[PDB]
Amino acid sequence: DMLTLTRYVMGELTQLLNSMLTAIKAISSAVRKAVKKLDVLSNSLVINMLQSSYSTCVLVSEENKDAIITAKEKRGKYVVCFDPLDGDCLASIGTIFAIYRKTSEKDALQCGRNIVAAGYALYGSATLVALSTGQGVDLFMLDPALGEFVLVEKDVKIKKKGKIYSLNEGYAKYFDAATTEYVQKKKFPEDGSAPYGARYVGSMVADVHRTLVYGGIFLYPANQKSPKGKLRLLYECNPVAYIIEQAGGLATTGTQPVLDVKPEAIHQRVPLILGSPEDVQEYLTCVQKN
Amino acid sequence: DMLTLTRYVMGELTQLLNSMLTAIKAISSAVRKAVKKLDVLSNSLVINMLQSSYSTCVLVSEENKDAIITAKEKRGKYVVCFDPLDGDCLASIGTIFAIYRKTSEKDALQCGRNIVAAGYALYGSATLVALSTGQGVDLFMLDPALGEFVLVEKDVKIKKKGKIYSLNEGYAKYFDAATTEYVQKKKFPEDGSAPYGARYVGSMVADVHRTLVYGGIFLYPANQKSPKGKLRLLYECNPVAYIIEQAGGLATTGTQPVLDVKPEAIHQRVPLILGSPEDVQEYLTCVQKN
Amino acid sequence: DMLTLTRYVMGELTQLLNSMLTAIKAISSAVRKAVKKLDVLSNSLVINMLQSSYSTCVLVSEENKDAIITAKEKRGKYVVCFDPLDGDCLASIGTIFAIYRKTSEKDALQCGRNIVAAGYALYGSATLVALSTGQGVDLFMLDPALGEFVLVEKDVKIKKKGKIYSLNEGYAKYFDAATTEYVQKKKFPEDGSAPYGARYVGSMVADVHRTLVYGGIFLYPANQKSPKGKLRLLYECNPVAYIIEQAGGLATTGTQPVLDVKPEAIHQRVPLILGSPEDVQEYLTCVQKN
Amino acid sequence: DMLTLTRYVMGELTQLLNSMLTAIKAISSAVRKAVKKLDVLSNSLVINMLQSSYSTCVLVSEENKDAIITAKEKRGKYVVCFDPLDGDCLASIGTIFAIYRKTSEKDALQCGRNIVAAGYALYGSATLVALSTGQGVDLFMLDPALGEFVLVEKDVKIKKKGKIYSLNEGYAKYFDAATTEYVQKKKFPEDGSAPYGARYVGSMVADVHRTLVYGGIFLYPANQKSPKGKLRLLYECNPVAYIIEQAGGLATTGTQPVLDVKPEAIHQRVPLILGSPEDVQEYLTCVQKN
Numbered sequence A, B, C, D: 001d002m003l004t005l006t007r008y009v010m011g012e013l014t015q016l017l018n019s020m021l022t023a024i025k026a027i028s029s030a031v032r033k034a035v036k037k038l039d040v041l042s043n044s045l046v047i048n049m050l051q052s053s054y055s056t057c058v059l060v061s062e063e064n065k066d067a068i069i070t071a072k073e074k075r076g077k078y079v080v081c082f083d084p085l086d087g088d089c090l091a092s093i094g095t096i097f098a099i100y101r102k103t104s105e106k107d108a109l110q111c112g113r114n115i116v117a118a119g120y121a122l123y124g125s126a127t128l129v130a131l132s133t134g135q136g137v138d139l140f141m142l143d144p145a146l147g148e149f150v151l152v153e154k155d156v157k158i159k160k161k162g163k164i165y166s167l168n169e170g171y172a173k174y175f176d177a178a179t180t181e182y183v184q185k186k187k188f189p190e191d192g193s194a195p196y197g198a199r200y201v202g203s204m205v206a207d208v209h210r211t212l213v214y215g216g217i218f219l220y221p222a223n224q225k226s227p228k229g230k231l232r233l234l235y236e237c238n239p240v241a242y243i244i245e246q247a248g249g250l251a252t253t254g255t256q257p258v259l260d261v262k263p264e265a266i267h268q269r270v271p272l273i274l275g276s277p278e279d280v281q282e283y284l285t286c287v288q289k290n
């Protein structure tokens, strides 16, 4: 029942990640105590902790129309795109972020392929963080007594093929043909296998995290209502795509890898299909055939 | 930023509820720190806290094959049927319980209509308890610093009609005709209205709680795989049926109210459809017509 | 085991007290996790939370040589003198503050008699706050789960006469004659009564708080080493003098009430003798006779 | 801001220490929430956690007149003497314990020299445990979020000579000549050095812990009122004597080392003088000369 603690590592980058985690700790504490007000607070904590890291030059927030430029005093090398509070019914909500090195708004419009670090936090019974700096995915638990994030699994790997599919089937009347076919195959396998189970929390970080630890596939594809999908490329899709690919998974828009999409605006939406590679590949077969 | 605290109330009954809440506080703390081991612990905490309340005579636990009879020393008037830990991916899991007055195992086999109190706890970012002693539903938050449950809403009422439907559609190939028709109507409304949204966490307490605070309908109906449904009558369906009806909702097996089912065994399963009354009533129309 | 919470009250004044409590909550959390660094942090939290209350115009901090003037944007009516962190061996350390209405540094140099509110926090096993706005002393416990201060006793009253005396007797060779005589009487009562017990934590807030709840007397009188005493008039002696007098006690320098001392500098020291009135009065008799 | 955790170690002995720590965690939580009732609870937690370790055969508690014999079912090799709750004014109170290997009550009446492990917990702003299994003293912090004790210093060593003396000088009129002389020398050094500072919290664990981390001397010697001292040999003096000696200090009754006293009853009191060795040695010189 006794432990020793040791500091864990994965320059300006380290200070920036510490400050993003420090904001996550504060948001966790606010969420536990608890809408519009939480969104504002969360945004303030992220922006201000990130700015006073002295590591940032440009931020993009889900909450702010335009990119935020760091005061010249505090400027550093990195660009951060984040969703401070993504997602009341205690459904686990989250924080999502991706970090780039600078190249103006320009700097925030890079291919996901250029990511240097990314992560998400999920505010559940425990506050969990998944993080990658390009050498796999590590999972951490917030210890709010220490004020520190504890490593709980190294180099998380997603299953090659899962048995869960996850999307809002309430949009069935708007689905494109490939989504309709794929869903039909999950429920009516044509190969003598059992149907997949269905899960959809309706909070992206919750659904993506389940997909990472249990395997399967998560989808918010384009539909007649949302022709470009709903989820946001810079600070939702790209970060989770990076995490999922670093765990051995795939993430696609249907027509290309999410991380290869060249962004055309900071609040651009894209379709998102991700998870176990054999599952995503099966979805991709339905696309190409339609 | 300053508060005063006041004790809240809804004899042996009060001691019993205090001890069930005390077990819930301990389980919350165990869950936050975290499978089979948790199930065992949770069960131990409930049984032992309940037994030393000196208010119980018979317990039924999801975890135990036979009913547990309280030592004659500690015996009181009440019977408690509970699921100590219902539901790893931080999906909110829960504890469910219903309390009866005695009439042997016999005493645990009463109609839901005979319930004196019931509740559930959901272990999310916060640990929430819904409770009723027959005069409506009250919602409480665990304050683990005080070690006490704080009232956060009195007399919770569910919406007459919602816009969410919640079931595992991965069982579509096993659905009975009425379930197939109902799902089809939610996705393809024949009245010019928008489709319902779909949500399914796959943890009953999470799905039921969302249904109470946002409205809509939750279903685990009979299907070819599970001809009697999956969820357990004594300590899952009856307790949540009691809560939901006390909030102005309905809960049915498809052929009768859950609380009117006369149990034939302690671990008996029944189909469960519950939520907003107009939604459940619509489901019932699909049944009667098939 | 169930509670209801109700907001408690004692305009700009209320916003200011909320922000001082909010800083106390943050300091509590920092202390629990834990020298020079804590002093700096504590100071930052107080100054910044107080400034963005929009209720302050001038601050005096134990940590800062000169008075801090609030930016004209954020200016309000009140003046706050505080010791952000007063007192490693887990000895309970504290935060002390007094609030005045403005009249420049001038505004911080008022008689204690002019205080509008004052308090201290003690960071023990629990974080406790004593507070007065002039209508007695109220005691609060920090509930760090709610993020709120809970009332635990109204209108705290100190005993007329106690049985504890509290001072650093290691300074005996420097004591003035009246202190020597008084100490001698506590140990060698000339009236057939039992000796007083001795207690000295060596952290002022700990010693003062014990004196309030158990009764007796606390002293840091002048001595040959410290001819004006050690403790600071504006943000140690005056605040605790105000609290102690509001609980029915007395606080003196030996020659006059602490709250009547007209300050001659912001970091001025004064002797401090406080506690149960009959005890302080006995000390005062030793003074007048010498 | 990221950490890794590693299990720390110092057979039945390990299970016993885990269960004593588990009781300490529960007591910490009770203290934080808070007299006679706490004493009872604390005692229950220790006894029951210790008994179900399956490592004990005989317990002695400050709270119980006679030794407690473990049910033959649960019996193991070890004997535990403990003070479950030693020491309301937030003064840090504590838990003290010493562990022996068996030789009946007989087994609890061994010389301190026979101790296999001992420790104390102090319930402050943080809950700290000092522990030794005979290879020095290790200091741990309770992390109540993890439910685990974190190592914060290895092999703690007390200063050879300190500058604090700690005793209740309110007993001056009852002191024996050697105590009077020693106190006089601390206040009136005859060697041109400065007087010692005085500290006395009046809670033994608080005073002993300060003495370990800051150095100096702590005394509760015999006096006319308490001719055998006040503190209890088996579960106060012996445990802290063992800790203090393992940190390079000394602990004496005035006439012999505490750990060499052969106990004559389980609730026997002895005088206690402990701390920095040069300080204790100086006290011993005053004894021998009187």
Ligand SMILES: O=P(O)(O)OC[C@H]1O[C@](O)(CO)[C@@H](O)[C@@H]1O
Pocket (backbone or CB within 6 Å): A086, A087, A168, A202, A203, A204, A205, A220, A230, A231, A236, B197
């Ligand atoms: O209700 P819908 O259309 O299924 O939207 C769900 C999505 O909306 C969001 O809340 C918006 O980012 C995501 O968390 C989630 O994945």
Ligand SMILES: O=P(O)(O)OC[C@H]1O[C@](O)(CO)[C@@H](O)[C@@H]1O
Pocket (backbone or CB within 6 Å): A197, B086, B087, B168, B202, B203, B204, B205, B220, B230, B231, B236
């Ligand atoms: O995976 P399925 O068949 O949808 O089962 C989900 C149900 O199983 C349970 O875990 C068992 O009680 C419920 O919490 C939940 O509602």
Ligand SMILES: O=P(O)(O)OC[C@H]1O[C@](O)(CO)[C@@H](O)[C@@H]1O
Pocket (backbone or CB within 6 Å): C086, C087, C168, C202, C203, C204, C205, C220, C230, C231, C236, D197
């Ligand atoms: O060591 P000394 O001289 O007794 O000083 C103790 C005093 O010093 C302080 O730490 C300084 O404010 C007070 O908390 C305390 O009352």
Ligand SMILES: O=P(O)(O)OC[C@H]1O[C@](O)(CO)[C@@H](O)[C@@H]1O
Pocket (backbone or CB within 6 Å): C197, D086, D087, D168, D202, D203, D204, D205, D220, D230, D231, D236
């Ligand atoms: O009030 P006194 O005689 O100084 O007693 C203090 C002692 O009493 C105890 O509370 C009893 O164990 C100890 O914690 C402490 O050292």
